[PDB]
């Protein structure tokens, strides 16, 4: 999580393990009921402003390896180019939705801007994977 500090600086705080444990174990699996975990994750992305690593941890905890892989792959399918339309250009896809830890600096606006886009894409990916599972 990212939090605006009392000194005007953005601070990184890791998820608490009790929160992670509870989110997973108080909830049905993603495959069994995609809507419940999707809603949970959407709220977490909003309220906790997680970093790229937080998102990996959140997905890793709540999803199985197969679920998580589908979700990230769907997220990358959601990347758009300048024309406001889909792109499959590796450099554009990787730039918006990196699968490897990026160099994004949470203390900077550029870095928080990348994070906002990444979380929007992740949510789309989650929604879209959920729908496939639902039909």
Residue numbers in the entry: 1 to 135
Quote what the paper states about this structure.
Mammalian cells show different susceptibilities to retrovirus infection. N-terminal β-hairpin and a core bundle of six α-helices. at positions 82, 92–94, 110, 114 and 117, can change the tropism of MLV.
tryptophan substitution at amino acid position 10 in CA. of the CA-NtD of this variant at 2.0Å resolution. RMSD of 0.6Å across equivalent Cα atoms. of the channel the aliphatic L10 side-chain forms the base. L10 in the base of the groove is shown in red. hairpin together with R112 and T107 from the α5–6 loop. residues 8 and 10 in the β-hairpin. forms part of the rhTRIM5α binding site. defined Fv1 binding pocket must be extended to include this region. observation that huTRIM5α restricted the L10W mutant virus.
